[PDB]
Design a protein around this nucleic acid. Structure first.
Lengths: 107, 107
DNA sequence: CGGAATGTAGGC
DNA sequence: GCCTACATTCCG
């Protein structure tokens, strides 16, 4: 029932999980969404999918409080949808671009 | 054509792609399969799917010559399915573990 | 909430 | 072409 630290949200990355934050133009504004990949490669987009995955897989070091769906938590790889006359390209952000995208979707 | 070098296979990884090798036991032996994730998040497991992906986006730094589906090419993250009394369980391999696993899927 | 029903995409 | 495996919708 209390705030998760960056250290804790980095922990599943040391146990075969991946976290991604993806930032697209929505109906009205710029918004971010968080994806997790389980060690098996399963893509999960919602916290109840993670709790369901944890309940049907061997309970090691990784537990429910290690997970955040916040696109404003700087843990994992960041991508954004950049539209140009050549078309919709997705591009991965450098570590240096990330804090300004997070500011842009704070609020 | 010509077999791609580690360096060429690492190129798309600087332009928002991910490469994974995933090993498990089949009928008689252990086998590897290569996955790629495009910068949009799309999972592709076959060479002609990457060709279809590349022709649907703008042709820049990334071309067909940079893609290998060979699970013996030590580029990207490696994982294996281990059968245990608690169930099938995927684990990410350390750099130190990868060579034994590639030797085991040659053949 | 935890599973069954139905839809879809890519594999063969 | 159908089949298999995953994603989404539906249900009490």
């Amino acid at each position: 029932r209390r705030i998760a630290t960056p250290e804790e949200v980095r922990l599943p990355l040391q146990h075969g999980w991946r976290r991604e934050v993806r930032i697209k133009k929505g109906s009205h504004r710029w918004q971010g969404e968080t994806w997790y990949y389980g060690p098996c490669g399963k893509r999960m987009k919602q916290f109840p999918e993670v709790i369901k995955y944890l309940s049907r897989n061997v309970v090691h070091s990784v537990r429910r409080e290690h997970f955040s769906f916040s696109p404003r938590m700087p843990v994992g790889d960041f991508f954004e949808e950049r539209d140009t006359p050549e078309g919709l390209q997705w591009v991965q952000l450098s570590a240096e671009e990330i804090p300004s995208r997070i500011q842009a979707i704070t609020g």
